[PDB]
Ligand binder design. Sequence first.
Ligand code: DGU
Ligand code: D54
Ligand code: MG
Ligand code: MG
Ligand code: MG
Ligand code: MG
Lengths: 371, 385
Amino acid sequence: IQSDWKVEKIEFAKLTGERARSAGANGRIGVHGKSCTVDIARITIDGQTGYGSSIHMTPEWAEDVIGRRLLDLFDDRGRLREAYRLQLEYPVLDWLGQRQGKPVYDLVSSLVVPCYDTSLYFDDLHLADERAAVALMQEEAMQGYAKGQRHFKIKVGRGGRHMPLWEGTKRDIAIVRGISEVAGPAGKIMIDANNAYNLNLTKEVLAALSDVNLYWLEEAFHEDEALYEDLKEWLGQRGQNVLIADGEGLASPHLIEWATRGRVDVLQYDIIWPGFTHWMELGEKLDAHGLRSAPHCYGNAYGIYASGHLSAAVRNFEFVEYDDITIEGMDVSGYRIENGEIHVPATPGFGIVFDDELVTYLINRSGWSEG
Amino acid sequence: LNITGIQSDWKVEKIEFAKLTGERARSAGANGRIGVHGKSCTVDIARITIDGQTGYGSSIHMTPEWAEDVIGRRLLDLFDDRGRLREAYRLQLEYPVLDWLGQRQGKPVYDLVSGAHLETGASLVVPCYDTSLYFDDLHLADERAAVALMQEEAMQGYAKGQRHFKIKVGRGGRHMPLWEGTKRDIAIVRGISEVAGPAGKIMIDANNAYNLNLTKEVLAALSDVNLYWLEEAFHEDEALYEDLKEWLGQRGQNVLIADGEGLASPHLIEWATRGRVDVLQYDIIWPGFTHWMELGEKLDAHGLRSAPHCYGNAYGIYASGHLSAAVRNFEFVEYDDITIEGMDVSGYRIENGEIHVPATPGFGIVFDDELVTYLINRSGWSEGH
Ligand SMILES: O=C[C@H](O)[C@@H](O)[C@@H](O)[C@H](O)C(=O)O
Ligand SMILES: O=C[C@H](O)[C@@H](O)CC(=O)C(=O)O
Ligand SMILES: [Mg+2]
Ligand SMILES: [Mg+2]
Ligand SMILES: [Mg+2]
Ligand SMILES: [Mg+2]
């Protein structure tokens, strides 16, 4: 990177699409829907462009950044400075890989990465018949299986808000078993309560699912060291191997410490916020402790492909959280799902080919430009 | 705070630190999330000497090396342009310093911080509540035996002049089977309600042991009880509290939502301004007294209520009483009956559900100079002279 290279232009557009199947409610909130959008920035440095997720960026913010040198955005250690990450880390890393003919997984390290189908929401809430609910949710897993998914995360916590407490929990249990039989003994099964349980409700559910191949338990309740210590001990005594997964949203400031003390196994900070640069630094610390990395990704299709590249820099990388989404102007065909794995194309940047012309249109129409 | 009377000649001459020890009147059992709390109590205390006079108060996050840098500074230096003790000194020295100012000016802290313009004199009497009703019944298999004991514990408080009670619930979250535990919660609350009478304000505190539907089940079951607030039903979540507030509205059930202790969501206050949470409960020591005077002005401006959390630190109780003079929507002093050695709080009294704050200078707590000196030398530290 020459001191000659500088931020010449920054453009912003919101891209829109849909996920393949509408997502229902989860433990804590209502229907998530089918409509999807991705905020993107196009950065121009040395007459060449880079593309990527961009959040927390205003026209007035990019205004102040035009003219600065690329080198000045990096550490005296080689890390994009906290001040630029959420706004530009993806457009910048994509630029570097284009200019260098390298995929980003190279710059940071064929790439094949485990992935799970995260789309199994409360899609059964209109059905009173527990059997029909199971058949509905099984058929949803199937759709995912047919597209090459082998591992599934199932939303649970129906009884927390959206259904009567005990009836909902019975329904949870029935849905998980019923999906376990679609996945087969080799399919990994995760469950996510979105905090809708408490410790004893959790224990009851876990005990009812002794048969099932439960890979991890995600957000049973808001992270609490005392509660997770108890839960880990209870699982061990029963010889029940289920990983404890947490970390998305407004996480406890002490979550990682708790994990270093064996209370949490899987950390799940979001792939966009705190993001890619953060995750590389984090993945190193967690690797050192033998802890596992599984970045949260939902509501942002771009994060899916970011996660994939990320894995090359993280030894203990668990899964790419997958949602099947088509974003107009964002060609992700370089990627393919096969037997529970996503194959990351070995092309420059993040291997996504944006429709330059459509993007220019959306910038003009509903976005903005500085430079 | 009026700081025009502070002479530039006044400097911090000495900072001394000790840990005082004591006991609460009745051992506190488990709560929704953790085990028995016990009977043993301590309070970390600092004694500051300025212009050859002393002040005493809570002090946390202070090391000898931190204090060393403060020795020699003018007291004026510790306050911002607006007569606000500066952030960097609050946790370590706010209480000792406020006590000092009161001792020197011969006024109680509530008079120093009220911002009152009218003539002073009238006594300060502040609502309080009994916070000591833990899961003291877990050894009891029979609900009746459990209800009976918890009623006895409430009446011990009533005998000492408490009228309002906060009851730990969430038994089924961890310590008891979920269904039985929740039935037990409900029976306990009704039981104490019966004993408290209809003038008695009843608060319940789940320590995050519920979920949304467990919460509604419990609240429905307690419709006839004088439920004043629901505290930490589950970890704060705007969408869940929105749902809960609407449900309570449709039912015409007027229970306030209280939250904010410990590691709070950074957006809790915002959620409260949007009407999802009514009572804010940041601790009286951390973030502390000065912080609370600013916060309380903010909450008052939104018609929100202040109920500083105080448990695990006896000193916090008395500080909370003085803080009430500076906040319009001050709710209650959270009260635990503790005796700390060397810390004479007899100027305060509990009468008919209120703590009476003495008009004596500073925080009106008379520390045992000799004992504290003894404890400073033996196990504490000193900087300055
Ligand atoms: O350390 C604190 C205790 O565990 C807890 O039971 C109390 O702080 C309680 O939540 C309260 O409102 O006073
Ligand atoms: O935006 C976040 C949604 O409400 C959650 O369902 C996401 C989540 O828990 C996950 O993907 O693991
Ligand atoms: Mg999740
Ligand atoms: Mg969490
Ligand atoms: Mg509480
Ligand atoms: Mg809380």
